């Protein structure tokens, strides 16, 4: 249930009979052969596999960053428990060959430690559910530290797993990246005294924001082309904090307000007053505040109910997060999918 390999070990090694492991061997043989580019696989928008081509230079640059940032030099004992049929797993092989690691390749499962005792590694990359599985399974929980140091991919860790990681005497990090950057371009520390919400940029990454305040990055991993995200961020020296999505966050008098969050708070007020009118929070330019939060409601309401509404809202939120005006529209504009066109609705109010 494991195939052991390496740069030099790959030179004499026979091709596995297990098809899964032969994927790895084939890729490695091709890497060593000198290929200038590679067709690997990722999941598309429908959750089905799709080919993507990446250059040798891209992969090599990405591997080098990881090695430097996490101090994983020659002799590193790495466990490969990500699907090598896909880019996440293949990157472990590239790092292994570029950085002279000993690679222990296992079949990707929910619990990478479950099948092998005498586990003893210096590095493993995995998804958060894999670490949670190891921690929950009392046959493997006691050996979680045998992972050495853990790099997590996938979605930011949930609260319960974050609390568990905080108590591990072992370095755990989480990646920020995308397929367009091959792999990660920044790393968050999830425990130890430097634990925080900041993603610290890997070396060789150039970074900045566009006019919306959204992160863009470029480097050898992007073939020097800048990649523009739609992630609203705040940069702090060589690191960033993720804030949200550009069109969903406003800045009113230096206070950041998330529109859908304020909407949920107002919704509880509507429900409580039995107001069936549709509504949405929005904003408008304001010289004093920058952006002024407002409230838009469909169909007029009686002055009495409007007064109740106004007062109840003001009692539930700070004056700084209270809509500064309530606009009433006869009918909300709708898209072709029957969704409120909020932007069009607002312009019409003029």
TrEMBL record:
Domain AMP-dependent synthetase/ligase: 38-189
Entry-linked Pfam families: AMP-binding
Keyword annotations: Ligase
Gene Ontology BP terms: fatty acid metabolic process
Molecular function GO terms recorded: medium-chain fatty acid-CoA ligase activity
Database matches in InterPro entries: AMP-bd_C_sf, AMP-binding_CS, AMP-dep_synth/lig_dom, ANL_N_sf
Protein origin, superkingdom: Bacteria
Residue runs in coiled coils: none
Record CDD domains: OSB_MenE-like (cd17630)
Similarity-based family: Belongs to the ATP-dependent AMP-binding enzyme family.
Matches recorded under PANTHER family: ACYL-COA SYNTHETASE, ACYL-COA SYNTHETASE FAMILY MEMBER 3
Protein name as annotated: Acyl-CoA synthetase (AMP-forming)/AMP-acid ligase II-like protein
Native source organism of the sequence: Dyadobacter fermentans (strain ATCC 700827 / DSM 18053 / CIP 107007 / KCTC 52180 / NS114)
């Amino acid at each position: 249930m494991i195939w052991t390999t390496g740069k030099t070990l790959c030179k004499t090694q026979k091709r596995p009979r297990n098809p899964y492991f032969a994927q790895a061997y084939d890729f490695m043989e091709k890497w060593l052969g000198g290929a200038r580019e590679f067709v690997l696989h990722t999941s598309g928008s429908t959750g089905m596999p799709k080919p993507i081509t990446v250059t040798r230079a891209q992969l090599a640059a990405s591997a080098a960053m990881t090695g430097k940032a996490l101090s994983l030099g020659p002799g590193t004992r790495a466990l490969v428990c990500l699907n090598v049929g896909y880019i996440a797993g293949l990157m472990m092989l590239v790092r292994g060959m570029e950085l002279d690691w000993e690679l222990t390749v296992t079949e990707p499962t929910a619990n990478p430690l479950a099948g092998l005792d005498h586990a003893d590694f210096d590095f493993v990359a995995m998804v958060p559910m894999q670490l949670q599985s190891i921690l929950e399974n009392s046959a493997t929980s006691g050996q979680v530290d045998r992972l050495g140091k853990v790099l997590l991919g996938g979605a930011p860790v949930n609260h319960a797993l974050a609390m568990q990681i905080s108590d591990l005497a072992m370095p755990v990090y989480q990646s920020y990246g995308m397929t367009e950057t091959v792999s990660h371009v920044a790393l968050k520390a999830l425990n130890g005294p430097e634990a925080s919400e900041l993603y610290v940029f890997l070396p060789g990454i150039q970074y900045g924001v566009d006019e919306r305040g959204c992160l863009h990055i470029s480097g050898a991993v992007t073939n020097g082309q800048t990649v523009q995200t739609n992630d609203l961020v705040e940069i702090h020296g060589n690191a960033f904090q993720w804030i949200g999505r550009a069109d969903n966050v406003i800045n009113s008098g230096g206070v950041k307000i998330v529109l859908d969050q304020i909407d949920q708070r107002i919704a509880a007020v509507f429900h409580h007053l039995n107001i069936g009118n549709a509504f949405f929070c929005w904003w408008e330019p304001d010289a004093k505040l920058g952006q002024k939060l407002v409230l838009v409601i469909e169909n007029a309401m009686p002055e009495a109910l409007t007064e109740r509404l106004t007062a109840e809202i003001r009692s539930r939120v700070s004056t700084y997060e209270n809509p500064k005006h309530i606009y009433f529209a006869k009918a909300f504009a709708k898209t072709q999918t029957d969704k409120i066109d909020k932007r069009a609705t607002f312009q019409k109010l003029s």
